[PDB]
Amino acid sequence: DQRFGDPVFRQLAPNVWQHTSYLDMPGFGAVASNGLIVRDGGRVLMVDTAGTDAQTAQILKWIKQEINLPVALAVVTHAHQDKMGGMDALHAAGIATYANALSNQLAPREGVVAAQHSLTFAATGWVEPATAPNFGPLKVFYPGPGHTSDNITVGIDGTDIAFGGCLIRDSKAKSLGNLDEADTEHYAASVRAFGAAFPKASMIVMSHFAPDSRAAITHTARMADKLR
């Protein structure tokens, strides 16, 4: 029988699925985290792990069962447990991993395993292509500091989808979440930078809410404005 801890999958587009897994921050709510699985021809690409290696391995099993293509690479969007808690599982599987250089630098401080490869960014926020080879339809953008100093975002070419990770909250959210590591001065402008980077995206995917419209962007920014 399927259990509450087992990842759940939602097909967002013909070649894109959301993974959702529930984790436990001690003393706090047990809570859900989303990432993406993208089919690009003969391979699969991932955005973020689950919050644990066990759940990440259950994700890779699903991919094997349901898609049966090799996972060529994963991009992870910041050095927090919900996004990088399954790096060992990825590495055990032979999956090449990539994160903001800054995420890799912060990883030991945040108790996550670093990715194998570092992404760097132009002053525009767009990833340097030499650091993101063969990413297929993944278009990586660093919007500036928000939820964390290192948070990155990923557009999916050939679809209506952009992934804001933990930077973006849905259009009915009442809070930006935990701000202990947030850049409260720049959060609003980074949210806006994200929305300007992926003007085509009509479906906004994020870590802790189900997918929403672009109103999630405007709403998160207008919440952030109140922190300055």
Residues that bind Zn ion (CB under 5 A): 80, 82, 166, 207
Shortest Cβ 190–Zn ion spacing (Å): 14
Q: Which is nearer to Zn ion, 56 or 207 (CB)?
A: 207
- Sites of contact with Mg ion (CB under 5 A): 53, 110
220: which 2 tokens? 């998160």
**Closer Cβ to Zn ion, 169 or 192, answer by number:** 169
The kind and range of the H/E element at 64 are helix 53-66
Match 């962007």 to its residue by tokens.
217
The CA-based diameter of the chain, rounded to the nearest angstrom, is 49
Cβ-closest position to Mg ion: 53
Q: Which is nearer to Zn ion, 72 or 113 (CB)?
A: 113
207 interface partner picked from Mg ion, Zn ion, none, CB below 5 to 8 A per type? Zn ion
Q: How far is the CB of 152 from Mg ion (least distance, A)?
A: 17
Per the CB < 8 A criterion, the answer to whether 117 and 97 are in contact is yes
- Closest approach of Cβ 213 to Mg ion, in Å? 30
Sheet of strand 71-76: strand arrangement: 8-13, 16-24, 30-40, 43-47, 71-76, 96-100, 117-119
